[PDB]
Design a protein around this ligand. Structure first.
Ligand code: HEM
Ligand SMILES: C=C1/C(=C\C=C2/CCC[C@]3(C)[C@@H]([C@H](C)CCCC(C)C)CC[C@@H]23)C[C@@H](O)C[C@@H]1O
Ligand SMILES: [Cl-]
Ligand SMILES: [Cl-]
Ligand SMILES: [Cl-]
Ligand SMILES: [Mg+2]
Ligand SMILES: [Mg+2]
Length: 430
């Protein structure tokens, strides 16, 4: 043989569907299933869309978490879209992952993402201006500066022209941007990143498997948030932590649990999502060179559709969970008030009922109504404009500085049923 650099990973034939998987081999409530590669996972969701578009599963038991009741899995696009856009029926309270909430977890994790309106929107409005397209556009210079420096450093730091895309670009770019928006000093950004890596890596032995470590990390980032907030209470800065401590909701300042939970939500979401879009995007360019070539020869013209196709392809957030407030029926399956419902974005984003040629990675795809940022409505990804900009700038800086950058090993995949994570991705360039 194939054209390119000698140690590049194998290419793939674009558009090839994965074989469907016998349904007896599918166990969404076992971590072992999440350790299977993406082709088996993709074929398994294909089987569910065909044979059992709504299906019930026991909740995975990770050490120290309470599985509680199982969940109804929505794997079709139209059902995920519907559930997302009916929050009075599909509530975000008490939690948006499959496990049960506890008071101990809610101290750090009881943010607006696990609330319904009106309180959810009152909290979101504290920070929403900072994430609008017009305001995010004004930090293009900061995104460029850090991406350009990171790519240059890949070259300066690696005489052998081998690097890990995750630790050297995809991780540190979004980290810098969200932490600077929050007002966190640079010296602490890597400490924040280690904390969010553990929070959203729990169950993968390379990150953490001891619940005691998970709770110490949670306590430590909560304490960090509280201390920074205290500083900003006394001396304002033009940052989001200051906005949080200065705001009032229903006539009351936020409590220290509310501040900590809001801070944690923003840095976790900012640090544990875009990096995977970027890394899966480089993996895809490596597998599908004709797509790299077409984007590189018209970068600005294709960027809007290319970024969105990277998000559809990667589906960095695998699912979100809701809880029914009333009985419903979908596709002949009667679900009860109080039951958990899981929305599988990874599956919606391959649904043949909504996408022409879903197994084709097409950077010109238009339209592209993917649910990688969710189905829309009240909780639609706050960071979506920021993420799109982070992705577009990262790829532009790769294109300009090291246009033939390519993966040289298959990814080390995060063991997670929530985050489509890549821990490392070795790359090279000429
Ligand atoms: C490609 C990157 C990203 C993806 C795929 C992604 C995906 C998602 C998804 C699926 C949701 C839930 C939507 C729903 O429930 O309807 C969400 C919510 C959220 N995301 Fe993003 N996200 C990304 C980047 C970011 C970034 C960079 C931030 C920066 C802080 C961020 C902040 C948030 C917040 C705060 C929420 C909660 C919104 C609310 O409850 O109103 N996200 N994201
Ligand atoms: C994930 C899952 C688990 C826990 C969920 C947690 C603890 C980490 C921080 C999270 C993920 C909060 C977090 C701040 C939300 C981040 C949103 C972002 C990704 C867009 C919300 C729920 C919070 C573990 C196991 O029961 C399996 C399950 O699957
Ligand atoms: Cl070297
Ligand atoms: Cl192609
Ligand atoms: Cl250029
Ligand atoms: Mg190295
Ligand atoms: Mg600063």
């Amino acid at each position: 043989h194939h054209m390119g650099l000698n140690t590049a990973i194998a290419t793939r034939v674009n558009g090839t569907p994965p074989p469907e998987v016998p349904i007896a081999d599918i166990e969404l409530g076992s971590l072992d299933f999440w350790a299977l590669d993406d082709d088996v996972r993709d074929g398994a969701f294909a089987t569910l869309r065909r044979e059992a578009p709504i299906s019930f599963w026991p909740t995975i038991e990770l050490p120290g978490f309470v599985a509680g009741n199982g969940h109804w899995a929505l794997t079709k696009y139209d059902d995920v879209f519907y559930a997302s856009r009916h929050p009075d029926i599909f509530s975000s309270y008490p939690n948006i992952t499959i496990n049960d909430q506890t008071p101990e977890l809610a101290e750090y994790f009881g943010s607006m993402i696990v609330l319904d309106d009106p309180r959810h929107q009152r909290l979101r409005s504290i920070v929403s201006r900072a994430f609008t397209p017009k305001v995010v556009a004004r930090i293009e210079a900061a995104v460029r500066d850090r991406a350009h420096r990171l790519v240059s450093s890949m070259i300066a730091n690696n005489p052998d022209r081998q690097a890990d895309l995750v630790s050297e670009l995809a991780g540190p770019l979004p980290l810098q941007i969200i932490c600077d928006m929050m007002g966190i000093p640079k010296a602490d950004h890597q400490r924040i990143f280690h904390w969010t890596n553990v929070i959203l890596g729990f169950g993968d032995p390379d990150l953490a498997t001891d619940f005691d470590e998970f709770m110490q990390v949670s306590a430590d980032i909560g304490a960090y948030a509280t201390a920074l907030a205290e500083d900003r209470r006394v001396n304002h800065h033009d940052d989001l932590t200051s906005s949080l401590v200065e705001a009032e909701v229903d006539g009351e300042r936020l409590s220290s649990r509310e501040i900590a939970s809001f801070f944690i939500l923003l840095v976790v979401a900012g640090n544990e999502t875009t990096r995977n879009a970027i890394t899966h995007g480089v993996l895809a360019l490596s597998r599908y060179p004709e797509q790299r070539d077409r984007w590189w020869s018209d970068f600005d013209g294709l960027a809007p559709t290319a970024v969105e196709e990277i998000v559809r392809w990667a589906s960095p957030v695998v699912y979100m969970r809701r809880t029914l407030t009333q009985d419903i029926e979908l596709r002949g399956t009667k679900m009860a008030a109080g039951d958990k419902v899981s929305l599988w974005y990874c599956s919606a984003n391959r649904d043949e009922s909504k996408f022409a040629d879903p197994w084709t990675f097409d950077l010109a795809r238009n339209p592209n109504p993917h649910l990688g940022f969710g189905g829309g409505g009240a909780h639609f990804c706050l960071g979506a404009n920021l993420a799109r900009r982070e992705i577009r700038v990262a790829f532009d800086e790769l294109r300009r500085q090291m246009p033939d950058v390519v993966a040289t090993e298959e990814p080390a995949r995060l063991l997670s049923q929530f985050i489509h994570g890549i821990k490392t991705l070795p790359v090279t360039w000429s």
